[PDB]
């Protein structure tokens, strides 16, 4: 939305009361630890491979 | 880890420990010989067309 305001050279806005706001910030930290057996994946149970 | 000296820690290893010995060869119970006659030892063969 547009809330156009022009200017002033002798006016000042003062806030008269406040609100305490609780916000949530969500941040990943770690990922799963995975290991691979190269021989078992590539060849399985074959000696020739 | 291809070395004769290993530093302190925990490591993941391969199998290197168990190998098969015996064998299982179960096949169906048929025994009748296939008719190699009339195919190899036949009297007349047809024309190629
Ligand atoms: C700014 O102050 C006024 C009081 O002067 C607040 O209005 C009060 O709000 C509380 C709840 O948070 C009520 O229990 C009070 O009864 C209200 N006023 C009175 C004294 O009757 C106002 O909430 C404050 N600022 C903001 C925007 O939260
Ligand atoms: C700004 O302030 C001066 C002070 O002399 C005044 O003359 C002028 O008219 C004002 N202009 C505005 C933006 O009101």
């Amino acid at each position: 939305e547009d809330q156009s305001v022009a200017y002033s050279n002798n006016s000042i806005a003062i806030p008269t009361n406040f609100s305490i706001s609780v916000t949530t910030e969500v941040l990943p930290v770690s990922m799963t630890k995975t290991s691979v057996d190269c021989n078992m994946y590539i060849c399985g149970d074959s000696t020739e491979c | 880890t291809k070395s004769f000296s290993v530093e302190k820690g925990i490591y993941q290893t391969s199998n290197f420990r168990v190998s098969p010995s015996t064998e299982v060869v179960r096949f169906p119970n048929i025994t009748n010989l296939c008719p190699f006659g009339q195919v190899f030892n036949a009297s007349t063969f047809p024309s190629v067309y």
Side-chain angles (χ1 to χ4, degrees):
Chain A
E1 191 66 28
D2 196 337
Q3 199 181 3
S4 74
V5 54
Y7 189 47
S8 183
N9 91 341
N10 65 23
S11 179
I12 189 58
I14 311 286
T16 79
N17 222 6
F18 49 85
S19 184
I20 292 297
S21 177
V22 175
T23 68
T24 52
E25 175 156 25
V26 174
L27 279 164
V29 168
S30 52
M31 65 179 288
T32 313
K33 292 152 59 176
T34 296
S35 66
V36 65
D37 198 318
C38 186
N39 172 236
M40 218 201 293
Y41 179 87
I42 298 299
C43 294
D45 50 344
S46 163
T47 79
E48 293 82 3
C49 183
Chain B
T1 59
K2 291 174 70 175
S3 67
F4 279 95
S5 296
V6 178
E7 295 293 328
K8 167 173 66 68
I10 177 170
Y11 305 84
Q12 293 82 17
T13 65
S14 175
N15 191 0
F16 283 122
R17 72 189 70 185
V18 298
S19 314
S21 179
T22 67
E23 188 82 27
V24 186
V25 186
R26 298 177 83 51
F27 273 3
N29 49 4
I30 67 188
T31 180
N32 203 321
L33 277 296
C34 295
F36 283 145
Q38 295 177 356
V39 175
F40 294 107
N41 206 19
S43 174
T44 307
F45 270 28
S47 296
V48 63
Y49 87 101

